[PDB]
Amino acid sequence: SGFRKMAFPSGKVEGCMVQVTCGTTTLNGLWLDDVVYCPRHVICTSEDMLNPNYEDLLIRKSNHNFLVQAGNVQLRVIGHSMQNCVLKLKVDTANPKTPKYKFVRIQPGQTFSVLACYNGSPSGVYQCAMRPNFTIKGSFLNGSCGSVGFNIDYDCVSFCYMHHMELPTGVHAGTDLEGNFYGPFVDRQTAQAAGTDTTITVNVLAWLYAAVINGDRWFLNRFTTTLNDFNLVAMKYNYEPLTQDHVDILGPLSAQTGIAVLDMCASLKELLQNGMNGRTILGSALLEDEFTPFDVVRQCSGVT
Amino acid sequence: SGFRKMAFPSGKVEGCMVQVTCGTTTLNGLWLDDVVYCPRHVICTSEDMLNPNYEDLLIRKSNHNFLVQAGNVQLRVIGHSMQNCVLKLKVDTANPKTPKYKFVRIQPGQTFSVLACYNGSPSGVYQCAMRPNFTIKGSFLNGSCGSVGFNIDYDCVSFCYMHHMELPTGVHAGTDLEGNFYGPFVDRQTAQAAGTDTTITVNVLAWLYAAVINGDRWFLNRFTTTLNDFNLVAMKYNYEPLTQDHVDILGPLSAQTGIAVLDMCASLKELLQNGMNGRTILGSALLEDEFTPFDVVRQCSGVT
Ligand SMILES: Cn1cnc2cncc(NC(=O)[C@@H]3CCOc4ccc(Cl)cc43)c21
Ligand SMILES: Cn1cnc2cncc(NC(=O)[C@@H]3CCOc4ccc(Cl)cc43)c21
Ligand SMILES: [Cl-]
Ligand SMILES: [Cl-]
């Protein structure tokens, strides 16, 4: 028992991290096969960030202007191209530590681990979720750009995020491994405000099932609700609308605990309306929404 | 910016995990050099756990009764010994992935990362702290025994914990890499209740400094306190007494933010007395105590 904000083991992704330097800018790159992926703003000065024409800035850069360093040895860049907001630097050596991998674009509500890096060196690993406003609440400093978000399916690493930017409000923006930003953000130092950060209802429900599985049962009540009834309360609390797909997704957790999905919805409805009353659930004084129903099943069953 | 419960990169420790089987019991082992460390209860049946005489049970076991499997290849056990509550299985091959390492016994309040494993395979990584009652609030299931807790100092892994047991209240108990349990726990299936789980005051103060560093400043007040005055309030809230050593430890965070340690103590004193009033600090509705002052500095400066 016990339920923790758990990240995937990072070793497979640590073996992919490299340092990319272009001129006076140094960020992280992801080395898979003979390609190094990094944010295209590696080609900018802090002044170019204000209004960058990336296609024009890139005309002035050649293969030798990109200094790629894996560990403490230099990689030879034999080609470079821009795919959306990422640069792909073709090197002459295939990464020997390249794991089985995929590039996936995730939906809001989905969770992933992040291996925060500085100068191609991993500093830490943590779990976060793609918010409904397409930002992430990470922990990134200057030099952390190029750090990646991922999920592991036994031996296959599914890369879903590359860190690019920090909005004025401290939240984070980035792209998938094809260079397409999550949400409306652009790689420009311009005022970009995120939209409403709603709560991922399906994830809160999954976390309430993890609490019942791990012995926290105080919040369980004698009521039930309907999808329409629960969604009226959820809207009022800036919770995402719950769909029949989310109910289906919760099916296995509902089977494991014997608590019907709509009964758990009524438990959540009362927690929203009454508050925690100074109580905690899985060591938390707030309703956690960064555990998907798949994460709950994986952690509670011990998938390796 | 952004402040997350961050674990150390786990790759160095993933390369040490092996599966240890003795009879019908299978748990995890830590392979460093030509030695495999694992909990001594690998030699017990679920019935032996009730009242085990380990020295007697071990008489019946030979080198060939310990099946050590690294990845999918078997290791040859050429010796075995019991050190306190751990078994050291000498193998004929030195682990090629053995990192630079140390065995350290940590004090309560200290934090470390845990790489949870099942059948020698890493399933996840998370951060936790040695509680003042010498338990940890981990996430471990049946088969997770032998999973280790560690800290990294650049390239040196300091192993501080091996998981052994789950108390009836869901909390966790284990030993250091010398086999000595943290606290009073014994490797017996007997009623063992943990003592008071007090809050690690120095860690809460360090986390309040991380909040000010990352822009959460609402809780800052116009008051100051003394060590004696703050400790009267802290005792009443089951907070650990704050010492001049803890004040000295906070010195650098105090310098970075310009907020005197005793001023932050008064901020904490008011949060304890008034509550959060439905507000959050670093995305938390409760005062987090599993970040040491060293963790705050490391994460906020990006030590790799
Ligand atoms: C500067 N900085 C501090 N903590 C950060 C965490 N993550 C990222 C950054 N970096 C940025 O956001 C830079 C700074 C200049 O403005 C822009 C504009 C667009 C883009 Cl794509 C990147 C950036 C951080
Ligand atoms: C059974 N189990 C379930 N979730 C666990 C998480 N961590 C550990 C265990 N295992 C144990 O605690 C076993 C079960 C039998 O009782 C004892 C007694 C002493 C010792 Cl050292 C180990 C154990 C877990
Ligand atoms: Cl910006
Ligand atoms: Cl027990």
Instruction: Identify each DSSP E strand in A11-99 by its residue range.
Output: 17-22, 25-32, 35-39, 66-70, 73-75, 77-83, 86-91
Distance from CA of A56 to the nearest CA of B (A): 31
Question: How far is it, in rounded angstroms, from Cα B258 to Cα A29?
Answer: 36
Chain breaks in chain A (C to N over 2.5 A) after: none
Find the closest chain A residue to B152 by CA distance: A123
| Class at the top of the CATH hierarchy for domain B1-14+100-197 | mainly beta
DSSP readout, B56-101? HHHHT--GGGEEEEETTEEEPEEEEEEETTEEEEEESS--TT--EE
Beta bridge mates, B159: B103, B150
Find out whether the beta carbon of B187 lies less than 6 Å from any atom of ligand 2. Answer: yes
Q: From residue A115, give the alpha-carbon distance in Å to each of A159, A185, B139, B171, B261.
A: 11, 22, 20, 28, 32
Find out whether the beta carbon of B228 lies less than 6 Å from any atom of ligand 1. Answer: no
For residue B186, report the distance from its CA to the centre of ligand 2, in Å. 11
* Domain coordinates in residue numbering, chain B: 1-14+100-197, 15-99, 198-301
For residue B244, report the distance from its CA to the centre of ligand 4, in Å. 38
Question: How far is it, in rounded angstroms, from Cα A237 to Cα B3?
Answer: 25
Q: Are residues B232 and B188 in contact, defined by beta-carbon separation less than 8 angstroms?
A: no
Find the closest chain B residue to A114 by CA distance: B6
Q: Are residues B207 and B198 in contact, defined by beta-carbon separation less than 8 angstroms?
A: no
Backbone angles phi, psi at A142, to 5 degrees: -60, 125
Chain A residues touching residue B299 (CB < 8 angstroms): 123-124, 139
Cβ–Cβ gap A302/B141 under 8 Å: yes
Question: How far is it, in rounded angstroms, from Cα A15 to Cα A71?
Answer: 9
SS3 A272: helix
Question: How far is it, in rounded angstroms, from Cα B22 to Cα A80?
Answer: 54
Fill in the amino acid letter for B82. Answer: M
Question: How far is it, in rounded angstroms, from Cα B205 to Cα A99?
Answer: 41
Q: From residue B289, give the alpha-carbon distance in Å to each of A165, A252, B55, B157.
A: 29, 34, 39, 23
Q: Could you tell me how many CB contacts below 8 A there are between chain A and chain B?
A: 151
**CATH superfamily name and code, B198-301:** main proteinase (3clpro) structure, domain 3 (1.10.1840.10)
Q: With 0-12 CB in 10 A as exposed, 13-18 as middle and 19+ as buried, what is B238?
A: exposed
Q: How many residues are listed for chain A in this entry?
A: 304
Fill in the amino acid letter for B15. Answer: G
User: What's A40's DSSP letter?
Assistant: G
Fold matches, A15-99 and A198-301: no
Question: How far is it, in rounded angstroms, from Cα B97 to Cα B157?
Answer: 12
CA end-to-end span of chain B: 16
B80-119 exposure pattern, b = at least 16 Cβ within 10 A, e = fewer: beeeebbbbbebeeebeebbebeebebebbbbbbbbbbbb
Residue with the two structure tokens 């997770």:
B144
**Tokens of residue B285, six digits:** 């509705």
Residue with the two structure tokens 């299931």:
B141
Beta bridge mates, B114: B126, B149
User: What's B179's DSSP letter?
Assistant: S
HSE value, Cβ hemisphere, 13 Å, CA-based, for A87: 34
Residue nearest to atom 2 of ligand 1 (CA): A142
Question: How far is it, in rounded angstroms, from Cα B93 to Cα B11?
Answer: 20
Alpha helices in chain A (DSSP H): 11-14, 54-59, 201-213, 227-236, 244-257, 261-274, 293-301
Quote the Cα angle for A37-A183-A248, to 5°.
105
Distance from CA of B122 to the nearest CA of A (A): 6
Question: How far is it, in rounded angstroms, from Cα B293 to Cα A140?
Answer: 18
Q: With 0-12 CB in 10 A as exposed, 13-18 as middle and 19+ as buried, what is A241?
A: middle
**Nearest Cα residue to B188 out of B39, B73, B10, B74:** B39
Q: Are residues B247 and B227 in contact, defined by beta-carbon separation less than 8 angstroms?
A: yes
Chain B residues touching residue A277 (CB < 8 angstroms): none
**Tokens of residue A4, six digits:** 């923790």
Cβ–Cβ gap A139/B215 under 8 Å: no
Q: Are residues B293 and B300 in contact, defined by beta-carbon separation less than 8 angstroms?
A: no
Chain A residues touching residue B7 (CB < 8 angstroms): 7, 124-126
**Three-state secondary structure along A167-201?**
CCCCCEEEECCCCCECCCCCCCCCCCCCCCCCECH
Question: How far is it, in rounded angstroms, from Cα A87 to Cα A42?
Answer: 9
Residue with the two structure tokens 């050429």:
B78
Q: From residue A103, give the alpha-carbon distance in Å to each of A124, A156, A184, A290.
A: 22, 11, 20, 21
**Tokens of residue B77, six digits:** 């056990």
Helix (H) or strand (E) holding A5: none
CA-based diameter of chain A, in Å? 68
Residue with the two structure tokens 């049970």:
B57
Phi-psi region of A156 (alpha: psi -120 to 50; beta: other; left: phi over 0): beta
Beta bridge mates, A26: A21
Q: Are residues A124 and A116 in contact, defined by beta-carbon separation less than 8 angstroms?
A: yes
Please report, to the nearest 10 degrees, the dihedral formed by the alpha carbons of residues B194, B200, B203, B205 taken in order.
160
Helix (H) or strand (E) holding A33: none
Alpha helices in B109-243 (DSSP H): 201-213, 227-236
**Nearest Cα residue to A252 out of A294, A222, A282, A208:** A294
Find the closest chain B residue to A274 by CA distance: B278
Q: What CATH number has the domain spanning A15-99?
A: 2.40.10.10
Residue nearest to atom 11 of ligand 2 (CA): B165
Q: From residue A200, give the alpha-carbon distance in Å to each of A67, A183, A241.
A: 41, 16, 9
Question: How far is it, in rounded angstroms, from Cα A129 to Cα A171?
Answer: 12
Alpha helices in chain B (DSSP H): 11-14, 54-59, 201-213, 227-236, 244-257, 261-274, 293-301
Backbone angles phi, psi at A64, to 5 degrees: -75, -15
Residue with the two structure tokens 């028992």:
A1
Provide the pairing of β-strand A73-75 with A148-153: unpaired
Q: Are residues A109 and A203 in contact, defined by beta-carbon separation less than 8 angstroms?
A: yes
Question: How far is it, in rounded angstroms, from Cα A59 to Cα B296?
Answer: 42
For residue B11, report the distance from its CA to the centre of ligand 1, in Å. 28
Find out whether the beta carbon of A145 lies less than 6 Å from any atom of ligand 1. Answer: yes
Question: How far is it, in rounded angstroms, from Cα B241 to Cα B231?
Answer: 6
**Nearest Cα residue to B290 out of B114, B163, B164:** B114
Fill in the amino acid letter for B138. Answer: G
What percent of chain A is helix, strand and coil (3-state, nearest 5)?
Answer: 25, 30, 45
Deposited experimental method:
X-ray
Cβ–Cβ gap A6/B125 under 8 Å: yes
Helix (H) or strand (E) holding B163: strand B156-166
Question: How far is it, in rounded angstroms, from Cα B11 to Cα B15?
Answer: 6
